Amino acid sequence: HHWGYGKHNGPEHWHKDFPIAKGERQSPVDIDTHTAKYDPSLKPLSVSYDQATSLRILNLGAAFLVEFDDSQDKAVLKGGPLDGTYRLIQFHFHWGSLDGQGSEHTVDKKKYAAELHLVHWNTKYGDFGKAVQQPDGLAVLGIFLKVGSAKPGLQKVVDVLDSIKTKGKSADFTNFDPRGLLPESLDYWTYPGSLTTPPLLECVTWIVLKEPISVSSEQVLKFRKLNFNGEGEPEELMVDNWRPAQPLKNRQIKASFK
Ligand SMILES: [Zn+2]
């Protein structure tokens, strides 16, 4: 009876196995744009993905991950609110059963159709496993998806999903350029938070881009054909794999823009 997104194992149940679910810096949160504070101390955000090396795409049950070779400084995030260098390890998405929901962060309570998370770890901690045990261990770039025009750079991801329909399946996925998933503007909000899936560790500097990317109805429809279950198990569509907004508590959200 492990955690998931269903009626009896979903987000309101997670605290029983993971008490930090009710902690002081949990994610996601609602971003109240009018209460967010423009911060002049914020240095420019640096996304250097030119030598990114994707390896594989995997259905882990709760989402699919595109994983990268993070054994060298090849795809890094720096600047913004960050001190030091954070290395890209994987990206994944959260999405809804309907276009009206799916994102984890919300903006003035608005839910987007999906949310992309590019996960990076602080190189001063040597690897991801050690990084998640640190309060500044990860930097996650969050990007909202709305339904409209297709995102051409997403299409290679959507076309391989038929090969990883069920939990446990993986496929080779080399030479994918995550620059094709970024919006024009790097304007962002930032705040200290957590992983949004168990173990919910409070190790994340969140950087959430203001500008969503547009993806087509057909593209998100393909996300919804995935399965939470493994092959040969009862079919349950991988939809609504999002945690809702958590209390902001003693935190301020900062904006990079005015
Ligand atoms: Zn995520």
Curated annotation (Swiss-Prot):
<comment type="subunit">
    <text>Interacts with SLC4A4. Interaction with SLC4A7 regulates SLC4A7 transporter activity. Interacts with SLC26A6 isoform 4 (via C-terminus cytoplasmic domain).</text>
</comment>
<dbReference type="GO" id="GO:0043209">
    <property type="term" value="C:myelin sheath"/>
</dbReference>
<feature type="site" description="Fine-tunes the proton-transfer properties of H-64">
    <location>
        <position position="5"/>
    </location>
</feature>
<dbReference type="InterPro" id="IPR001148">
    <property type="entry name" value="CA_dom"/>
</dbReference>
<dbReference type="InterPro" id="IPR018338">
    <property type="entry name" value="Carbonic_anhydrase_a-class_CS"/>
</dbReference>
<feature type="binding site">
    <location>
        <position position="94"/>
    </location>
    <ligand>
        <name>Zn(2+)</name>
    </ligand>
</feature>
<keyword id="KW-0479">Metal-binding</keyword>
<feature type="site" description="Involved in the binding of some activators, including histamine and L-histidine">
    <location>
        <position position="90"/>
    </location>
</feature>
<feature type="site" description="Fine-tunes the proton-transfer properties of H-64; involved in the binding of some activators, including histamine and L-histidine">
    <location>
        <position position="60"/>
    </location>
</feature>
<dbReference type="GO" id="GO:0018820">
    <property type="term" value="F:cyanamide hydratase activity"/>
</dbReference>
<feature type="binding site">
    <location>
        <position position="117"/>
    </location>
    <ligand>
        <name>Zn(2+)</name>
    </ligand>
</feature>
<dbReference type="GO" id="GO:0032230">
    <property type="term" value="P:positive regulation of synaptic transmission, GABAergic"/>
</dbReference>
<dbReference type="GO" id="GO:0051453">
    <property type="term" value="P:regulation of intracellular pH"/>
</dbReference>
<dbReference type="InterPro" id="IPR036398">
    <property type="entry name" value="CA_dom_sf"/>
</dbReference>
<feature type="active site" description="Proton donor/acceptor">
    <location>
        <position position="62"/>
    </location>
</feature>
<keyword id="KW-0007">Acetylation</keyword>
<keyword id="KW-0225">Disease variant</keyword>
<dbReference type="GO" id="GO:0045177">
    <property type="term" value="C:apical part of cell"/>
</dbReference>
<dbReference type="GO" id="GO:0046903">
    <property type="term" value="P:secretion"/>
</dbReference>
<feature type="domain" description="Alpha-carbonic anhydrase">
    <location>
        <begin position="1"/>
        <end position="257"/>
    </location>
</feature>
<keyword id="KW-0597">Phosphoprotein</keyword>
<dbReference type="GO" id="GO:0002009">
    <property type="term" value="P:morphogenesis of an epithelium"/>
</dbReference>
<dbReference type="GO" id="GO:0008270">
    <property type="term" value="F:zinc ion binding"/>
</dbReference>
<dbReference type="GO" id="GO:0004064">
    <property type="term" value="F:arylesterase activity"/>
</dbReference>
<feature type="binding site">
    <location>
        <begin position="196"/>
        <end position="197"/>
    </location>
    <ligand>
        <name>substrate</name>
    </ligand>
</feature>
<dbReference type="GO" id="GO:0070062">
    <property type="term" value="C:extracellular exosome"/>
</dbReference>
<comment type="similarity">
    <text>Belongs to the alpha-carbonic anhydrase family.</text>
</comment>
<comment type="function">
    <text>Catalyzes the reversible hydration of carbon dioxide. Can also hydrate cyanamide to urea. Stimulates the chloride-bicarbonate exchange activity of SLC26A6. Essential for bone resorption and osteoclast differentiation. Involved in the regulation of fluid secretion into the anterior chamber of the eye. Contributes to intracellular pH regulation in the duodenal upper villous epithelium during proton-coupled peptide absorption.</text>
</comment>
<dbReference type="GO" id="GO:0070050">
    <property type="term" value="P:neuron cellular homeostasis"/>
</dbReference>
<dbReference type="GO" id="GO:0044070">
    <property type="term" value="P:regulation of monoatomic anion transport"/>
</dbReference>
<keyword id="KW-0456">Lyase</keyword>
<dbReference type="GO" id="GO:0015670">
    <property type="term" value="P:carbon dioxide transport"/>
</dbReference>
<feature type="binding site">
    <location>
        <position position="92"/>
    </location>
    <ligand>
        <name>Zn(2+)</name>
    </ligand>
</feature>
<dbReference type="GO" id="GO:2001150">
    <property type="term" value="P:positive regulation of dipeptide transmembrane transport"/>
</dbReference>
<protein>
    <recommendedName>
        <fullName>Carbonic anhydrase 2</fullName>
        <ecNumber>4.2.1.1</ecNumber>
        <ecNumber>4.2.1.69</ecNumber>
    </recommendedName>
</protein>
<dbReference type="Pfam" id="PF00194">
    <property type="entry name" value="Carb_anhydrase"/>
</dbReference>
<feature type="modified residue" description="Phosphoserine">
    <location>
        <position position="163"/>
    </location>
</feature>
<keyword id="KW-0987">Osteopetrosis</keyword>
<keyword id="KW-0963">Cytoplasm</keyword>
<dbReference type="GO" id="GO:0038166">
    <property type="term" value="P:angiotensin-activated signaling pathway"/>
</dbReference>
<dbReference type="GO" id="GO:0005737">
    <property type="term" value="C:cytoplasm"/>
</dbReference>
<keyword id="KW-0862">Zinc</keyword>
